[PDB]
Design a protein around this ligand. Structure first.
Ligand SMILES: Nc1ncnc2c1ncn2[C@@H]1O[C@H](COP(=O)(O)OP(=O)(O)O)[C@@H](O)[C@H]1O
Ligand SMILES: Nc1ncnc2c1ncn2[C@@H]1O[C@H](COP(=O)(O)OP(=O)(O)O)[C@@H](O)[C@H]1O
Ligand SMILES: [K+]
Ligand SMILES: [Mg+2]
Lengths: 829, 48, 49, 37
């Protein structure tokens, strides 16, 4: 739909009836199709078909058949308890989904790509979707194009970053009148857009683990049900008793709300993270951040502050006595609303008497090449009152000399002093900037170096120290030379193994064997003189060795690296494209925020893992107890008691998402074989405890075994199962022994209340025909505590360079060699 | 670590004693006497 | 000669199908490599001779 | 008697020597590059 779907001259050319700057009277627009068309607003706030949706399903059908086959509404004892359990599961699921969907949207709101349109006044900006179609737009150097459309008549070329919706990853340089694609970035440019198709033709991992776990649990429940049905067939049980058995085992076996409570834990953790100034794009980024082993962070803005200190410019040069300040400030963009960190320090340190007032007047800029990362060099051409074209150049100290090597070519008197001074200021931890000037058509003097300095953030050193205890390995990425990077590493205690990116082999190699360039990249404390492509190459290499890499991105240059990284982190002050391509967007600066978010994500993952182990352990426990007891002895717990056991497993679990869970000291990952081993062993231990409990009463009579004065088997088993099952959470939510960390008051209270309810059930026996002695419950508590201790001890006991053989090194060498020979041949002699 | 492993051993012994007393339907007082004796002998009070 | 409008997504989905598409061009290496970059086919192009 | 009875060169395989060689070599190449020709 182009012409008949909301597009013609009056939303196209009537846009360009005013000047560039101005817009008035969004009049009667007749249609606001802007808010992610029919995606979030699709069937708005139904809020009642989610409730009934939880009442329909495989297990819910089994429960409905159970509640119907209880002689209908004859008596409110079996029907009442079964419908109560079904209602409780439905309500808990609905509340959890509501909480998880009402808090992931609050993170979406605080991260929407706000869009700027300039009207008569200095209009701030327009919130993303509520912008009228057929309206002007200002896409400015790394902003996600809010609305699809075409360019405005003004002449300028913007390099739109594509391959998000198209194929080519290179410069897709639409110039004038072409189709500008929405939800795409702009690498560089300054153009205006006319809106067309404002919402038309816009062309995790824990969930899969949960799905697999649920499938295996279903398999286990089916196996148990098969045992029960076979053993009932051999005994010729009436169909009603078989149905009661299968209902009990269906209730205990399949966890109704495992993925729901896992998503609730993720959502609560994401909300807590966003409270800590760390907004998560996709809910799956929590696990990815918890799993990262290497954090490749840019030095500027993360490991150090963006404000620079200037210390005595090196004005020791030839004829040029003081021109450093004047010519360097000549190359200032002076916008004061889009200038970078480098530009500010020149203006703040312009306390110069002779000509600093007269140097900013009449020096009209003709050409201003922006700072190119591949060149590390800003070049400006301006006018002067003398009439000359002073082409200022400013960049890395060596690159300025590489620029001035043509005229006045490398005199030994000045070049040696220049290199010695830049090395000396590297030793002093000073960022240096060189400047060269062009008076005439054949003059090229070298002015000198400018010793800027940006100190590390006051919390950076201890943050890096603690990051080594967390299992991370921080790899700094500097565009600076090797000397400055190495001195910064010495200052930060980051270790001094800094390799120049181009020399090492990131990209076009230097005939370094491929098996060892990967080894150097893996064991490297940093990378100096890094270009945008080297970031992606570093991420690609580090993942081959088997790591999970977290990249600190900022700006549109490192968007592909952010996408390729397992956890792309958009640091403070990033552009719209950088945070759109990242996984976690930060609203606080420094590495301290990143490390705090890492610790929080590890805590959230610990909560998730502890709950999963809890759920499947008690599932295995209670299924291999009840199924075995039915098979061997044609007996099972009373249906009301087993329903209440299931309920108690949905009360002590709506609190796991809110507790003081500790964080692992090493990167944490889904070790599914170890998870299943631990859970099967815990369930087997619990089942052995329960079987001992019941075989005591077989051995010494109904009221003579684990019970002392009087009791009944069913309520005693109820109490033992409830205690040993709910107390299992205290050992899964710990690092080592269960007494290491103190559980939160909420979890402890919710579990102690359930324990009190189970004890009252046993003492007064209000679902069976007899009560239990007050000393029998004491003995059951003692035995359950012993089982808890042995189970926790089992859980605690089992809780705990070239990275390649000949095959791996050969493979990496072959990969790098084939890349190099492809380049070599492609050169075609 | 040694104390933790010794605690594990004492808990295992106490579990054996309590299970074997449950099968014999020992009165709670005798079970408590047994567990007191084994607690006294098992955990070293002043090793560290 | 531009690629067919369905070629890029076809090559993307062919990687999920287990295939590995090997282009054969009579062109020089540079044109083939640029076409591979356009199509998302990966850039390891070797002159046959 | 039981207590008494039970009472009682390059130090590396290929892996260890390779690891130490790699460590020293990476130190040297880091210094070499840091010199920056
Ligand atoms: N705006 C600028 N004008 C001139 N030189 C610059 C500018 N920004 C950075 N440089 C120089 O380029 C080199 C590193 O630039 P960069 O790659 O930007 O460091 P970072 O990537 O850590 O911001 C240093 O020599 C620095 O002084
Ligand atoms: N009919 C032709 N006349 C001249 N040059 C041709 C002709 N057909 C192809 N070429 C050139 O030969 C080279 C490839 O030819 P070919 O081997 O035909 O490509 P394809 O095999 O992909 O059709 C290219 O340089 C192409 O321009
Ligand atoms: K990613
Ligand atoms: Mg930087």
């Amino acid at each position: 739909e182009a012409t008949p779907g909301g597009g013609r001259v009056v939303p196209e050319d009537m846009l360009q009836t005013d000047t560039r700057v101005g817009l008035t009277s969004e009049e009667v627009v007749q249609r606001r199709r802007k808010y992610g068309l029919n995606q979030m607003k699709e069937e708005k706030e139904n809020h009642f078909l989610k409730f009934l949706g939880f009442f329909v399903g495989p297990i819910q059908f089994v429960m409905e058949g159970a509640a119907v086959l209880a002689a209908g509404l004859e008596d409110w004892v079996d029907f009442g308890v079964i419908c109560g359990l079904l209602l409780l599961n439905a309500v808990v699921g609905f509340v959890q989904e509501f909480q998880a969907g009402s808090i992931v949207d609050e993170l979406k709101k605080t991260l929407a790509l706000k869009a700027v349109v300039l009207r008569d006044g200095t209009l701030k900006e327009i919130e993303a979707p509520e912008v009228v179609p057929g309206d002007i737009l200002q896409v400015e150097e790394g902003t996600i194009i809010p609305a699809d459309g075409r360019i405005v008549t003004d002449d300028a070329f913007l390099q739109v970053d594509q391959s998000a919706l198209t194929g080519e990853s290179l410069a897709v340089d639409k110039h004038k009148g072409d189709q500008v694609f929405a939800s795409s970035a702009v690498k560089r440019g300054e153009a205006f857009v006319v809106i067309t198709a404002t919402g038309d033709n816009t062309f995790g991992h824990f969930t899969e683990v949960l799905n697999g776990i649920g499938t295996i649990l279903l398999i286990l429940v089916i196996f148990t049900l098969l045992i029960v049905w076979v053993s009932s067939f051999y005994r010729s049980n009436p169909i009603v008793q078989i149905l009661e058995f299968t209902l009990a085992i269906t209730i205990i076996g399949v966890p109704v709300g495992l993925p729901a409570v896992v998503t609730t834990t993720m959502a609560v953790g994401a909300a807590y993270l966003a409270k800590k100034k760390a907004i998560v794009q996709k809910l799956s980024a929590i696990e990815s951040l918890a799993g990262v082993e290497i954090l490749c962070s840019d030095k500027t803005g993360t490991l150090t502050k963006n404000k620079l200190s200037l210390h005595d410019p090196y004005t020791v040069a030839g004829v040029d006595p003081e021109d450093l300040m004047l010519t360097a400030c000549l190359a200032a963009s002076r916008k004061k609303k889009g200038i970078d960190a480098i530009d500010k320090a020149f203006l703040k340190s312009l306390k110069y008497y002779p000509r600093a007032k007269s140097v900013l007047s009449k020096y009209k800029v003709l050409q201003f090449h922006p700072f190119d990362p591949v060149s590390k060099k800003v070049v400006a051409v301006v006018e002067s009152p003398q009439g000359e074209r002073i082409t200022c150049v400013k960049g890395a100290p060596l690159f300025v000399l590489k620029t001035v090597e043509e005229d006045h070519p490398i005199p030994e008197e000045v070049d040696q002093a220049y290199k010695n001074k830049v090395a000396e200021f590297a030793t002093r931890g000073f960022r240096s900037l060189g400047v060269a000037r062009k008076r005439g058509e054949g003059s090229w003097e070298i002015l000198g170096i400018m010793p800027c300095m940006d100190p590390p953030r006051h919390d950076t050193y201890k943050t890096v120290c603690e990051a080594k205890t967390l299992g991370l390995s921080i790899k700094m990425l500097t565009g600076d030379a090797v000397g400055i990077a190495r001195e910064t590493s010495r200052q930060l205690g980051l270790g001094t193994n800094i390799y120049n990116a181009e020399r090492l082999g990131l990209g076009g190699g230097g005939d370094m064997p491929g098996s060892e360039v990967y080894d150097f990249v893996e064991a490297a404390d940093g990378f100096a003189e890094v270009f945008p492509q080297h970031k992606y190459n570093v991420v690609e290499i580090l993942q081959q060795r088997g790591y999970l890499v977290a990249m600190t991105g900022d700006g549109v240059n490192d968007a592909p690296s952010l996408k390729k990284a397992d956890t792309g982190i958009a640091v403070e002050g990033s552009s719209d494209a950088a945070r759109s391509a990242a996984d976690i967007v930060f609203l606080a600066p420094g590495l301290g925020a990143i490390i705090d978010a890492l610790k929080t994500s590890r805590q959230i993952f610990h909560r998730m893992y502890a709950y999963v182990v809890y759920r499947i352990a008690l599932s295995i426990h209670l299924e291999i107890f009840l199924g075995l007891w039915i098979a061997i002895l044609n007996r099972s717990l009373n249906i009301e008691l087993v329903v209440f056991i299931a309920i108690f497993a949905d009360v002590a679990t709506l609190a796991i998402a809110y507790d003081n869970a500790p964080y692992s000291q090493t990167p944490v990952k889904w070790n599914l074989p170890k998870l299943w081993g631990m859970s099967v062993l815990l369930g087997v231990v619990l089942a052995v405890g329960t079987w001992i409990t019941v075989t005591t009463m077989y051995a010494q009579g109904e009221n003579g075994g684990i019970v002392q004065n009087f009791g009944n088997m069913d309520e005693v088993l109820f109490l033992q199962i409830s205690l040993t099952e709910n107390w299992l959470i205290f050992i899964t939510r710990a690092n080592g022994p269960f007494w290491s960390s103190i559980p939160s008051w909420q979890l402890s209270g919710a579990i102690f209340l359930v324990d009190i309810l189970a004890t009252c059930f046993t003492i007064w026996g209000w679902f069976e025909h007899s009560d239990t002695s007050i000393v029998a419950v004491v003995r059951i508590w003692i035995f359950s505590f012993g089982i808890f201790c042995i189970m926790g001890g089992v859980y605690y006991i089992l809780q705990d360079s070239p990275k390649g053989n000949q095959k791996q090194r050969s493979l990496e060498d072959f990969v790098v060699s084939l890349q190099r020979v492809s380049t070599q041949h492609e050169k075609s002699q």
